[PDB]
Amino acid sequence: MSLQEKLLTYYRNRAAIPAGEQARAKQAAVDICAELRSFLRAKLPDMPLRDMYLSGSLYDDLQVVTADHIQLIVPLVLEQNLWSCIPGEDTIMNVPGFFLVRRENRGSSYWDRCVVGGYLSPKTVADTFEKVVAGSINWPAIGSLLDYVIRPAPPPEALTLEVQYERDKHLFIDFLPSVTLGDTVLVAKPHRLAQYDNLWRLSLRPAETARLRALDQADSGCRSLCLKILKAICKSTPALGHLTASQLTNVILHLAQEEADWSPDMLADRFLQALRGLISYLEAGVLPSALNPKVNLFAELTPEEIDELGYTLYCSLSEPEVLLQ
Ligand SMILES: Nc1nc2c(ncn2[C@@H]2O[C@H](COP(=O)(O)OP(=O)(O)O)[C@@H](O)[C@H]2O)c(=O)[nH]1
């Protein structure tokens, strides 16, 4: 077979999620989200929140192999005049793509409770909801009308709920606290390196995936399909598991800036170009975000982890078919 054929076979048999499993898992999330809105509205009346909503690859049809996880965004309500956010490149940590949230002026905020040293801690905010998750063993049988049973995920996933549905199906929904100041959207998703775990993370995923969708919609291209193959490959081994969806998505987006033709028959050529690009970014130890160039997406990896990834992908341009096995 030509590489083209092996790629389509790989996507079909490995990357692609069965349309049945996919939609059913999706509905489970929708069902639980709707329930969690109502119940938590009553269980946490003091907490300034917006409506919770779903987010992630499962919601965008970019999830691969199996459908088992999705994010539940928890938007905190902040008084814009009592808080300011500071871009990481302007702090002592010097981490682009990550933010401090500083308490301002006077007034009272419910969220004053999560402030330490005059800053809103993403970890302290997380601990508030780890309590809420752990406290779910006190809840009534929510969603029991549609035969769902909500249980705290097994440790250490202190922010995850586990939804079991028909039959021996499990959907893992993790709570993700989010903060909007001005037009800056931040999520409490810790920096990989622990010395940065108290910085808020700038939300880049909605813009990345929207760009991906718009580009493929315009010409029925195979950018998304190619991405899904990569995500599936990177889920195959521990080594390649240190690569993220965001990283691979931005590899694709960068290549899309150089290549306009993403016809289905160009898939194999793009897949090779994608690997070449990935190798070059690893070589340089820098993968700039396509939508926010100031942010290096490889800055959560140690230089050794980067070198080891490069070593893992060294012969991929000459033996690409090996990745699919
Ligand atoms: N839903 C969501 N996830 C984010 C965001 N920022 C970072 N992430 C993280 O990125 C991951 C989800 O991205 P996703 O596209 O689903 O990757 P996938 O799990 O490989 O399919 C999770 O680990 C999230 O914690 C964000 O703004 N929204």
Q: At 307, phi and psi to the nearest 5?
A: -65, -35
CATH number, domain with residue 1: 1.10.1410.40
Task: Judge if the beta carbon of residue 245 lies within 6 A of ligand 1.
Answer: yes
What region, left, alpha or beta, does residue 56 occupy, with left being phi > 0 and alpha being psi -120 to 50 degrees?
left
Indicate if 66 and 194 belong to the same structural domain.
yes
Contacts of 234 (CB under 8 A, 6+ apart): 240, 241, 243, 248
CATH number, domain with residue 117: 3.30.460.90
Of 64, 71, 300, the one to substitute when testing ligand 1's pocket (max ligand atoms within 8 A of C-beta) is: 71
Indicate if 293 and 269 belong to the same structural domain.
yes
CA dist., res. 46 & res. 72, Å (int): 20
Question: What is the whole-number distance in angstroms between the Cα of residue 104 and the centre of ligand 1?
Answer: 30
Indicate if 167 and 215 belong to the same structural domain.
no
Annotated binding-site ranges for ADP: 55, 57, 69, 203, 205, 231
Out of 174, 203, 232, pick the residue that ends a domain.
Answer: 203
Question: 6: exposed, middle or buried (C-beta count within 10 Å: 0-12, 13-18, 19+)?
Answer: middle
Indicate if 216 and 199 belong to the same structural domain.
no
Q: Are 54 and 29 in contact (CB under 8 A)?
A: yes
Indicate if 102 and 246 belong to the same structural domain.
no
Residue 68 lies in domain: 17-203
Residue with tokens 């521990």: 238
- E strand residue ranges, the chain: 53-55, 69-76, 83-87, 98-103, 115-116, 119-120, 149-152, 160-165, 169-181, 184-187, 200-202
Question: 268: exposed, middle or buried (C-beta count within 10 Å: 0-12, 13-18, 19+)?
Answer: middle
**Across the strands, what pairs with 151?**
162
**Across the strands, what pairs with 72?**
54, 175
CA dist., res. 96 & res. 98, Å (int): 5
- What method was applied to determine this entry? X-ray
Question: 128: exposed, middle or buried (C-beta count within 10 Å: 0-12, 13-18, 19+)?
Answer: middle
Q: Are 179 and 203 in contact (CB under 8 A)?
A: no
Indicate if 189 and 110 belong to the same structural domain.
yes
Indicate if 105 and 250 belong to the same structural domain.
no
- For residue 221, give both structure tokens: 């291209």
Indicate if 129 and 61 belong to the same structural domain.
yes
Task: Judge if the beta carbon of residue 247 lies within 6 A of ligand 1.
Answer: no
Strand 69-76 relative to strand 169-181: parallel, antiparallel, unpaired? parallel
Question: Nearest-CA neighbor of 262 among 294, 215, 211, 214?
Answer: 215
Out of 173, 203, 233, pick the residue that ends a domain.
Answer: 203
- DSSP of 183-207, one letter per residue? TEEEE----SSGGGTTSEEE--HHH
Report CA-CA distances (Å) from 161 to 63, 72, 108, 137, 156.
Answer: 19, 10, 31, 11, 12
Question: 194: exposed, middle or buried (C-beta count within 10 Å: 0-12, 13-18, 19+)?
Answer: exposed
CA dist., res. 50 & res. 48, Å (int): 7
Indicate if 76 and 145 belong to the same structural domain.
yes
Indicate if 60 and 187 belong to the same structural domain.
yes
Indicate if 40 and 106 belong to the same structural domain.
yes
Q: What is the dihedral of CA 54, 171, 62, 299, to 10 degrees?
A: 80
CA dist., res. 323 & res. 325, Å (int): 6
What region, left, alpha or beta, does residue 220 occupy, with left being phi > 0 and alpha being psi -120 to 50 degrees?
left
Residue with tokens 């905010």: 125
CA dist., res. 133 & res. 151, Å (int): 9
Contacts of 44 (CB under 8 A, 6+ apart): 132
Out of 188, 203, 218, pick the residue that ends a domain.
Answer: 203
Contacts of 306 (CB under 8 A, 6+ apart): 282, 285, 298
Task: Judge if the beta carbon of residue 191 lies within 6 A of ligand 1.
Answer: no
- For residue 209, give both structure tokens: 């995936």
Question: Nearest-CA neighbor of 163 among 183, 184, 136?
Answer: 136
CA dist., res. 202 & res. 91, Å (int): 15
Indicate if 100 and 161 belong to the same structural domain.
yes
Q: How many domains does the chain have?
A: 2
Contacts of 183 (CB under 8 A, 6+ apart): none
